[PDB]
GROMACS .gro file of C-alpha atoms in nm:
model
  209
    1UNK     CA    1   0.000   0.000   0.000
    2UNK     CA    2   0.313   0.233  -0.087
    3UNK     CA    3  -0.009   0.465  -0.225
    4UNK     CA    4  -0.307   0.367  -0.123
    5UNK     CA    5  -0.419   0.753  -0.119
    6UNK     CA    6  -0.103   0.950  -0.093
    7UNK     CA    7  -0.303   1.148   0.184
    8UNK     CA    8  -0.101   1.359   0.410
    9UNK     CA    9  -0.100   1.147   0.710
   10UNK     CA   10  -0.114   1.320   1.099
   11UNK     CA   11  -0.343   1.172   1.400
   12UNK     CA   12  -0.523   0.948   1.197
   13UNK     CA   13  -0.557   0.681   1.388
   14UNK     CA   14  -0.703   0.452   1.097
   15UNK     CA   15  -0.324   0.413   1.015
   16UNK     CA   16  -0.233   0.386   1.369
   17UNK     CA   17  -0.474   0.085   1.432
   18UNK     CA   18  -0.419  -0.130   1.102
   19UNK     CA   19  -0.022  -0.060   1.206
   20UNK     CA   20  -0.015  -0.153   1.566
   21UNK     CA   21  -0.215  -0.467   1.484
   22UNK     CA   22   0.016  -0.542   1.222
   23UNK     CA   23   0.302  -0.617   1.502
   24UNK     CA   24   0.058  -0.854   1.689
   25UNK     CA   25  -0.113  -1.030   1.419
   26UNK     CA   26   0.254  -1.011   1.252
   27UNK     CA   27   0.426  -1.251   1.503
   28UNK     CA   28   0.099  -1.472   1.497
   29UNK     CA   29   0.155  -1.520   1.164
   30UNK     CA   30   0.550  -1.576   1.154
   31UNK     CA   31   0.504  -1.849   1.379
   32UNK     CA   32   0.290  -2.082   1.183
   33UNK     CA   33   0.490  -1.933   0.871
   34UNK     CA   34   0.781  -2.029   1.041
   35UNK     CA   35   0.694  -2.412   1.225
   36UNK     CA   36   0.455  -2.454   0.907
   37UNK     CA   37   0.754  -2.450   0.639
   38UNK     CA   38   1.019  -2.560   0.897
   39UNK     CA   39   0.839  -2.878   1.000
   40UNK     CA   40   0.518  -2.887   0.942
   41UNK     CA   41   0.497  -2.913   0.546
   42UNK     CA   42   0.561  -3.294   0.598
   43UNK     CA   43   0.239  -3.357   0.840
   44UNK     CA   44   0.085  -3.065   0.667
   45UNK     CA   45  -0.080  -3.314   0.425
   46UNK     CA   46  -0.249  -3.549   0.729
   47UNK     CA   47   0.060  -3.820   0.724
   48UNK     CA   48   0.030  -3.886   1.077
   49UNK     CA   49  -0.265  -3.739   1.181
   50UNK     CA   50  -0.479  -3.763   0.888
   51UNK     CA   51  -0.802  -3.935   1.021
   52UNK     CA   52  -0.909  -3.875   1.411
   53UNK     CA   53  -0.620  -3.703   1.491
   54UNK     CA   54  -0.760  -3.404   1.289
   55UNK     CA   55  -0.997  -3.320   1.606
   56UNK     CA   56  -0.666  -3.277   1.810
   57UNK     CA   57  -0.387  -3.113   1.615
   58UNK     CA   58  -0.439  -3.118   1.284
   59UNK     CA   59  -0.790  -3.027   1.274
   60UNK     CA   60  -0.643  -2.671   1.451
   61UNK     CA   61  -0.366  -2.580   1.287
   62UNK     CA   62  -0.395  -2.778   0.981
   63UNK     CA   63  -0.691  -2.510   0.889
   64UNK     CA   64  -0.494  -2.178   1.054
   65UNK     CA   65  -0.261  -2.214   0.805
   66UNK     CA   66  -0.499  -2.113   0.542
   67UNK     CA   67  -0.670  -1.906   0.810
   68UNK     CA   68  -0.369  -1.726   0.950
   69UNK     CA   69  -0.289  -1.593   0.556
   70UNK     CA   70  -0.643  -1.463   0.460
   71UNK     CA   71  -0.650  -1.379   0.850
   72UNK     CA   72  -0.482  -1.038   0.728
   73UNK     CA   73  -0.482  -1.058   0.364
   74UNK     CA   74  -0.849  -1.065   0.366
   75UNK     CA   75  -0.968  -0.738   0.563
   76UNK     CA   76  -0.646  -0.562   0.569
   77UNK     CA   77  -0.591  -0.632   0.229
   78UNK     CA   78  -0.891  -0.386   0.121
   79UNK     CA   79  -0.940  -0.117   0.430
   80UNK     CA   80  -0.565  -0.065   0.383
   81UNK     CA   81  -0.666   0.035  -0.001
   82UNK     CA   82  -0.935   0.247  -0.115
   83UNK     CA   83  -1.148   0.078   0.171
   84UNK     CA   84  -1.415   0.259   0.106
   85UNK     CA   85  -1.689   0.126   0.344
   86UNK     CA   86  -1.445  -0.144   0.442
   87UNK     CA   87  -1.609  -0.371   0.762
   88UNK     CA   88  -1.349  -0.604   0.976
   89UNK     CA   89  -1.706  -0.791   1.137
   90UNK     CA   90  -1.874  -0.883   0.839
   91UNK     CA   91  -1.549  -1.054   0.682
   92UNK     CA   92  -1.446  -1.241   0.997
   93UNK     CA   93  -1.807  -1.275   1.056
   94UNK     CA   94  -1.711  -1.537   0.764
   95UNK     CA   95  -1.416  -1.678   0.885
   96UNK     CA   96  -1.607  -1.730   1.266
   97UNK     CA   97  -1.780  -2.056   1.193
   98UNK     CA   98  -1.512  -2.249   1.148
   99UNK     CA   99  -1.282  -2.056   1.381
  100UNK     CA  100  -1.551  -2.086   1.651
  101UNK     CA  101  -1.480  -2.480   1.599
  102UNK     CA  102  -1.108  -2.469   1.599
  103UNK     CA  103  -1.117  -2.227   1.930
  104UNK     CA  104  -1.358  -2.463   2.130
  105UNK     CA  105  -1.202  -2.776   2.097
  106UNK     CA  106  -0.836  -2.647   2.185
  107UNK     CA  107  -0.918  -2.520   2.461
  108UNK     CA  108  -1.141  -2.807   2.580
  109UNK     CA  109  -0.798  -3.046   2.387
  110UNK     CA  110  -0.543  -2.858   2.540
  111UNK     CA  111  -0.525  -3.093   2.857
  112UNK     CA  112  -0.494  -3.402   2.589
  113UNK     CA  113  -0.235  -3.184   2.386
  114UNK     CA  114   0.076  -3.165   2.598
  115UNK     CA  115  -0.019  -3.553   2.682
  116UNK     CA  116   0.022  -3.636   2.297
  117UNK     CA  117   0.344  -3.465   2.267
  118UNK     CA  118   0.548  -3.615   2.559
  119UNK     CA  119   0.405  -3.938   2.423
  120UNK     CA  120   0.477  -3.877   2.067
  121UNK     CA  121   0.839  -3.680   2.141
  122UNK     CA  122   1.009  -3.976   1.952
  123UNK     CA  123   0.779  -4.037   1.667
  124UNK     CA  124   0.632  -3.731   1.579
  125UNK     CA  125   0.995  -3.565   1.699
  126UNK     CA  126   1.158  -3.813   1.402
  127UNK     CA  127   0.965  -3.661   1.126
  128UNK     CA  128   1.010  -3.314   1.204
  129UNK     CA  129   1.395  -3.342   1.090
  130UNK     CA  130   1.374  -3.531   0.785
  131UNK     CA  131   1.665  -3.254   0.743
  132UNK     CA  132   1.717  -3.029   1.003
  133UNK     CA  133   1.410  -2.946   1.224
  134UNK     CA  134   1.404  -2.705   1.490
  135UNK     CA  135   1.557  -2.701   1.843
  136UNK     CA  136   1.301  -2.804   2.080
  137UNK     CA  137   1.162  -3.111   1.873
  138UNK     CA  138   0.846  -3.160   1.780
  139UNK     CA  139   0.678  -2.994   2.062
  140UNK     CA  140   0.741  -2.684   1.914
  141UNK     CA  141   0.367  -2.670   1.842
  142UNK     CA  142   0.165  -2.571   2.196
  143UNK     CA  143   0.522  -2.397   2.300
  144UNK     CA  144   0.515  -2.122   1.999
  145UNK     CA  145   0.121  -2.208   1.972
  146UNK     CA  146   0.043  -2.106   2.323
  147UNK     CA  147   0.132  -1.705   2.255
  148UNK     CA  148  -0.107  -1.660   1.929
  149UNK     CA  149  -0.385  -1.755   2.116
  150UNK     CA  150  -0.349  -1.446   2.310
  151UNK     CA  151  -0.414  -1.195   2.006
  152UNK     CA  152  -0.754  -1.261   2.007
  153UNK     CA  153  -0.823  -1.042   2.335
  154UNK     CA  154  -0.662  -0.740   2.106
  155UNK     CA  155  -0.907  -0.847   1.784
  156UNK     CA  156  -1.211  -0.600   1.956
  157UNK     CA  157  -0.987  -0.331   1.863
  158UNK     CA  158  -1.033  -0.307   1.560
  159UNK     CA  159  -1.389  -0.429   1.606
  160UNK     CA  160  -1.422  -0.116   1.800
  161UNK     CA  161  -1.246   0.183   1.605
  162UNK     CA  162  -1.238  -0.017   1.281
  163UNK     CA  163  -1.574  -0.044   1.268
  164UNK     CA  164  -1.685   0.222   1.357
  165UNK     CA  165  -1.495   0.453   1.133
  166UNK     CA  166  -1.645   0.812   1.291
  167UNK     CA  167  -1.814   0.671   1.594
  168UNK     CA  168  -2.190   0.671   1.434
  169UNK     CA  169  -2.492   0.544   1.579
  170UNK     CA  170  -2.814   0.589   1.289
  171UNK     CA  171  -2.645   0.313   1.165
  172UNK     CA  172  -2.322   0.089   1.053
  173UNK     CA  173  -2.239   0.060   1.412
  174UNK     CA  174  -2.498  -0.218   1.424
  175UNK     CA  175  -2.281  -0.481   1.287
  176UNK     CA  176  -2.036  -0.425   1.543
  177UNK     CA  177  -2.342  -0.553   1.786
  178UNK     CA  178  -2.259  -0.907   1.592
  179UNK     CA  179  -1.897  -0.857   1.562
  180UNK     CA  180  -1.812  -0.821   1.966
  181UNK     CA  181  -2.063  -1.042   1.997
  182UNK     CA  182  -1.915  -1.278   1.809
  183UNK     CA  183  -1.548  -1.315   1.847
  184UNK     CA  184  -1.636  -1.233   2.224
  185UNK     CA  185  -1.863  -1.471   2.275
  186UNK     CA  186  -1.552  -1.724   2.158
  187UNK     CA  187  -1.376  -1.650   2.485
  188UNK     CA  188  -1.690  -1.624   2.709
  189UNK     CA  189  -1.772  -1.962   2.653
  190UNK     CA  190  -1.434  -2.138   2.714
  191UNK     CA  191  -1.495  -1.999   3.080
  192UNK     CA  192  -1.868  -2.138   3.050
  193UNK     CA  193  -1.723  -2.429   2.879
  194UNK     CA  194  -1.538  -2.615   3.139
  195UNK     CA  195  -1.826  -2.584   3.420
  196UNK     CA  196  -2.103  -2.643   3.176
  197UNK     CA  197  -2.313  -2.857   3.371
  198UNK     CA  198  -2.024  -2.958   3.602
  199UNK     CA  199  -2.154  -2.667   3.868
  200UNK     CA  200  -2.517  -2.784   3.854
  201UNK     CA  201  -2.451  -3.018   4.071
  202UNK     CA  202  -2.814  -3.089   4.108
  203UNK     CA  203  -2.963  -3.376   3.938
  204UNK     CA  204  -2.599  -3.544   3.895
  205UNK     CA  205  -2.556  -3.852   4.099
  206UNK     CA  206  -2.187  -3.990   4.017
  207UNK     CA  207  -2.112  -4.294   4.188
  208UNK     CA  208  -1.761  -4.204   4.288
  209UNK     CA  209  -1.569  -4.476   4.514
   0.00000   0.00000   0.00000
């Protein structure tokens, strides 16, 4: 976007915000770039975890990798030229109900996760070289995979300012209702997640020794 306006920039945020995500959303990309091409082209096509395994690893960030490219290069890609009446929520409004799926089940997998890893240090840590993997084996996954999963409390933000462009309120705004609804609602249920139906406690009868 060397041009995409040639507009004298000063305290425009617009520029601000689409930069300052960049740096996040940046090093949450250059991670999978980085274990995607460095060791993960070879299970990249399912070898090992092709069927069932999908739900665990795989399944996760076998799809970011598409995700984490059109991630930026789908939103970004236009607001940053002529975005006209360019809207962050109705794109990843797209991209949500498979995310949605992805973000669940870690979270709810992430116990079973670090159990696979330690267990499969020796196999899956084999393939990985093939050449000249990484340092820290195979692991490498929830390790540099544990960070990127922290950008999404920073996504609002440009839900928020993004979105809204010059505040508003007639209208326009009223996707954002969806938006924050949305990619919040991701996180909000994790928490709801974990004691759904476990703090009932009420017509549960376990019979515990």
């Amino acid at each position: 976007m060397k041009g995409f306006d040639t507009t004298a920039i000063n305290k425009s945020y617009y520029n601000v915000v689409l930069q300052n995500i960049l740096e996040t959303e940046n090093e949450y990309s250059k991670e999978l770039q980085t274990v995607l091409s460095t060791y993960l082209r070879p299970l990249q096509t399912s070898e090992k975890l092709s069927s069932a395994n999908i739900s665990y690893l795989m399944g996760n960030l076998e799809e970011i990798c598409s995700f984490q490219q059109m991630l930026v290069q789908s939103l970004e890609e236009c607001t940053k030229l002529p975005e006209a009446q360019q809207r962050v929520g109705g794109c990843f409004l797209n991209l949500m109900p498979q995310m949605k799926t992805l973000y669940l089940t870690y979270c709810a997998n992430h116990p079973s996760a670090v159990n696979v890893l330690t267990e499969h240090s020796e196999e899956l840590g084999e393939f990985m070289e093939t050449k000249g993997a990484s340092s820290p084996g195979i692991l490498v996954l929830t390790t540099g995979l544990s960070k990127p999963f922290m950008r999404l409390d920073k996504y609002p933000t440009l839900l928020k300012e993004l979105e809204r462009h010059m505040e508003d309120y007639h209208t326009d705004r009223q996707d954002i209702q969806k938006s924050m609804a949305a990619f919040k609602n991701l996180s909000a249920q994790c928490q709801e997640v974990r004691k759904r139906k476990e703090l009932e406690l009420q017509i549960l009868t376990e019979a515990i020794r």
